[PDB]
């Protein structure tokens, strides 16, 4: 990973910012890294693990909750909550709000789902089932989102939620079912068209989901990548923020940081 780290640095010298890159092929175990360890915020990104945590629980002790029917009170409802904005009266299923949290990163959905598995507290609780003991959310939507460089709560690394999204939707984290359904969440995902998609070929699949925060420019993409019709998949971790708190989110970045991990695991 000698020349990607060093595309990287480029890269993250281009923006001033700060670039925390993890990439792992699922069939060689190769990883590309690139201040993978270092302390970045999850934001929405945390949306895909707890619908897996939701998709576990169903599986595995709580039988029918997916079809389970959850209300709010239009004052429950969150910035950014555009599918269940339309939905006060009528509620929706636990699986349509996973499909919410996903695929439109919806807010109160999110938190609908925390409600379903013990809160921040039980999704820490489900990282640590899947062997991350450094991955933590502390608060509810929306004030996860509020990161600042020495934040520690509501955190990740690339590696450790690189790893995790790994196990879920490539490893043996869920029942195949649950497994299919998850990936096709975040292959429906409208949220990332600028980031990770946009820097790979249009023909390969990619489920993915985004986190942002205005504040220092904070932008993640975390994706499984089928890169091509018949490919063992890859798995893409990427954080990033600005060094200044009133900098913009940079989409292209994240797009190029795709590019180079995908060249620097022989895939593109």
Not at 92 to 100: F, H, K, S
Not at 227 to 235: E, F, L, Q, R, T
């Amino acid at each position: 990973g000698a020349r990607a780290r060093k595309e990287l640095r480029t890269l993250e010298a281009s923006f001033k910012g700060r670039i925390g890159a993890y990439a792992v092929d699922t069939a060689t175990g190769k990883t590309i890294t690139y201040r993978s360890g270092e302390r970045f915020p999850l934001l929405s990104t945390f949306k895909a693990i707890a619908a897996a945590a939701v998709l576990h629980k169903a599986r595995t002790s709580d039988p029918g909750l997916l079809n389970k029917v959850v209300h709010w009170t239009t004052a429950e409802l969150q910035e950014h909550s555009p599918v269940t904005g339309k939905h006060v009266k009528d509620g929706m299923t636990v699986a349509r709000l996973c499909e919410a949290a996903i695929t439109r990163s919806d807010n109160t959905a999110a938190n609908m789902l925390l409600k379903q598995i013990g809160g921040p507290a039980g999704l820490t609780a489900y990282f640590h089932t899947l062997k991350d003991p450094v991955s933590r959310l502390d608060r509810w939507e929306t004030e996860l989102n509020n990161w600042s460089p020495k934040e520690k709560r509501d955190t990740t690394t690339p590696a450790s939620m690189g790893r995790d999204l790994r196990a879920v939707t490539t490893g043996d984290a869920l029942d195949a079912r649950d497994r299919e359904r998850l990936n096709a969440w975040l292959t429906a995902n409208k949220t990332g068209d600028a980031r990770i998609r946009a820097g790979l070929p249009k023909t390969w699949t990619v489920g993915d989901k985004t986190g942002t925060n205005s504040k220092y420019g904070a932008g993640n993409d975390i994706a499984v990548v089928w890169p091509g019709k018949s490919a063992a998949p890859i798995i893409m971790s990427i954080y990033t923020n600005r060094g200044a708190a009133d900098a913009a989110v940079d989409d292209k970045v994240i797009a190029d940081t795709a590019a180079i991990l995908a060249r620097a695991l022989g895939k593109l």
